[PDB]
Amino acid sequence: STGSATTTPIDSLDDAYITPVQIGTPAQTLNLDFDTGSSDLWVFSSETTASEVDGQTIYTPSKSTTAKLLSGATWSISYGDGSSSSGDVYTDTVSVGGLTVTGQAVESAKKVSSSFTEDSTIDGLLGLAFSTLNTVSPTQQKTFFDNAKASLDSPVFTADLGYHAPGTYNFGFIDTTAYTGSITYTAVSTKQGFWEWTSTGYAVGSGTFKSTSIDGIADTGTTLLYLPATVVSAYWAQVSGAKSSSSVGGYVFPCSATLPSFTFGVGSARIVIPGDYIDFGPISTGSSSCFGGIQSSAGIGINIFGDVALKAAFVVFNGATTPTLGFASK
Secondary structure, eight states: OOEEEEEEESSTTOOOEEEEEEETTTTEEEEEEEETTOOOEEEOBTTSOGGGOSSOOOBOGGGOTTOEEEEEEEEEEEOTTSOEEEEEEEEEEEEETTEEEEEEEEEEEEEEOHHHHTOTTOOEEEEOSOGGGOOOBSSOOOOHHHHHGGGSSSSEEEEEOOSSSOEEEEESOOOTTSSSSOOEEEEOBOTTSSOEEEEEEEEETTSOOEEEEEEEEEOTTOOSEEEOHHHHHHHHTTSTTOEEETTTTEEEEETTOOOOOEEEEETTEEEEEOGGGGEEEESSTTOSEEEESEEEOTTTSSEEEOHHHHTTSEEEEEOSSSOEEEEEOO
């Protein structure tokens, strides 16, 4: 089997991407944030505290003939940005782009933090990291991908995120028309539960490539590119007037600037992030200070190849017995 679904930016900045997902019988379609940095499929639901729902579409398990309470199971998750959610668990039929999993754990939110409430466009998350990170207790549950894997034509999914445009998540096949040149594959460590890999270095603009190992995760659920302070300082030093602002919470730059590109290494290959991808616009409406899309990972504890980086590539998440990651230009 295979599946193919379009993923759409939630706003003009590509802050996140939503992908329609069919849950239950008859289908209830919710728009979920596919997140290769976590491993829970959770949704706004008929059980979510009413004051914490503001415009989201909810899953109502009582209206699904295939929903079953997973008795005794609870979940609770905290994300890197400080947001969180928790609740109980149902199993139900879940389909993405024509690919159907029966008996999928659908984590029903009883509580969500304010950032989720305030984002009316995201009806939940669909985790695509390794199932060892799944938070369901006392019986850990498998991700949608883990459940689908054996049925897939090939045990892979791909992320093809758009810049200010829709893109695609495919399951079970590699669309050889969706990228240019060849795909370069690189080793993955699953020790922390993430799609963790080591970039071979970077360049700023037309500058020379610096060969240096940068361990980080491929995370579709993180907006920006978070790299070591040395790398980030080297980038922003090429933008006149750019500075790190503790009050704003990162590097800012004059909105009048033209940003240089940023290149990262995948083995001997190179992925170029155009300068425009690094512009996250005014810090507040009407400001001439703009927020940067490359930020320091210092104090996160991990480097994160978020959407800013991934949307410059066609990315293969290879879930073979020994997982790997592939990157191509597009």
